[model samples]
Target chain A: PVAHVALPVPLPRTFDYLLPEGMTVKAGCRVRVPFGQQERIGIVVSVSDASELPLNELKAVVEVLDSEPVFTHSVWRLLLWAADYYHHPIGDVLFHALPILL
Target chain B: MPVAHVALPVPLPRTFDYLLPEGMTVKAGCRVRVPFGKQQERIGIVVSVSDASELPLNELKAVVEVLDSEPVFTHSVWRLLLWAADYYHHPIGDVLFHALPILLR
Candidate 1:
């Protein structure tokens, strides 16, 4: 599945990743994935059952940090509004919402 | 005249504290500039005033400049940001930075 991962960066859109075998995840959960040169913790904004990246190009998520999503459906509004109002990328906004020390 | 509680936008969860330069009228919600990390200087928001810092006078750095005479956010906007910070469980300092003009950010 293609999970839309939002990393905290200048990029305007989320990055896509192929889910690893037996690694269960859902939207709004924080996951650690490969960034430019190192692993970074990012939020899974949404997940789909497909991917645009070729199978050879897709990177599997390194780790799933949260067993469940940090924000439930109701709290999703705050995430959406913060991104919309600030004109900041949703992935960047989502990373700021996390309390866990990076 | 001293001891500023600054809100920086770095990924961490805590606010940074700096010593305000003498003679500048700083208060909660104004901006101050200070040396961040190694070589960069950043405009930091004065989230609140304090009598003293737990760190000794020598360890805390000084604010190089003050940027505003008034609290930056208007009343309703401030309220919304405060609520948003609480809602997301993020520190209010970063929220204050988010409201700053891009030049300061």
Candidate 2:
């Protein structure tokens, strides 16, 4: 099955990609994917096989960055709220929460 | 008696300007308004009265907003967060947001 992930782009949206060749990844899992001309890291927001992009062109995930989610449910909710209130890019906001060196 | 305050500019630095008309009487815990970038205004604490600014004097944006008349934050709390942000290497925005009351968010 394919997974819907929120890429760290400046736009206020997410993208869909084909699942990797291995195990299934769940929501909140950190996954690295091919974004534009470069690779970017993002979290899996949802899982779905049906995507807007053609299956042939869709890229597979590079790897799962973390085994467990870094944020709690409440913190995740707060992050969403902050994004809405501040009108900022969600992907960048996610990166801001993590350590600068990560 | 002028006061030195910090403006919230995106450049990661503060500007020095003549304090508001009423800011000279403010203490450590008082809030005042200060002119920022073109057409921008910000709420700031009366940090002190000494600053090193070489810009030519011009008409400044008057204090248009005031959050409180009394000290809303203690020196200890303020310094603690500054120290913590330095230790963690976090952005000032992140540290300020975390320190704010939930209602402000």
Candidate 3:
């Protein structure tokens, strides 16, 4: 599956990560992904069957942090809506709604 | 108002400690009045409530009033402001104070 992840960055867009075989994660679940030189935690916004990037070029998600969604589906939608309405970074908004220990 | 670490509108990097008056209750992000210089009382945001202080308990001044029954900002908004302060290398108290209306500040 393809996971579109929102990282705690100032950027507006989400990064796509290839899910490993036998792994499944729902939206709002935390995952660790390679971001440039460092691995960073991010929220999975959605799961799909395909990615726009060449399959070979896409990076696989390194780890999934939770067994369940941290935020409910409704709260997830609100976070996305808030990011768009406030013209703020989505990742920052999501992370802000969550505890820093995460 | 309980024993809390308050963020005042000062240039200092750290939050000041204040005692909560008996029977009063306050949460972090609530506004509180505490004795400042000499006889002056300053209003500041409660950053945290704690049971311990490094200084002598008798030296701590009690909070004069509790301004908000609930926190002024939601948890998410509060965290965002705190993160903004860290990223901008500014004092947390100043950042939090400036985020409010002039009347509240």
Candidate 2 lDDT, A1-102, residue by residue in tens = 101111112223345667756646765567777654577667765576654444545667777777786667777777656754764444545657656424
Predicted structure with the largest lDDT when compared to the true one: 3
TM-score of each: 0.42, 0.39, 0.43
Q: Write the per-residue lDDT of candidate 2 for residues B1-105, one digit (tens) a residue.
A: 011010011222122344344433445434566554445555554433343323323432344444566656666876775566445543433454456575244
Q: Against the true structure, what is every candidate's RMSD?
A: 14.2, 16.7, 18.7
lDDT of 3 by residue, B31-92 (tens): 88776545467678887787756455765667878888998888988888778866754446
Place model 3 in a CAPRI quality band.
incorrect
Provide per-model DockQ scores: 0.03, 0.02, 0.01
Query: B1-105 in candidate 1: lDDT tens per residue?
Result: 011111112332234567766675676666677665455676667656676554456666777776778877676776687677656745455566655565244
TM-score of 3: 0.43
- Give me the overall lDDT of model 1: 0.58
Prediction-by-prediction clash tally: 0, 1, 1
Where is model 1 chain B poorest over a 10-residue stretch in terms of lDDT? B1-10
Chain B only, TM-score of each candidate:
0.70, 0.51, 0.80
What is model 3's DockQ versus the real complex?
A: 0.01
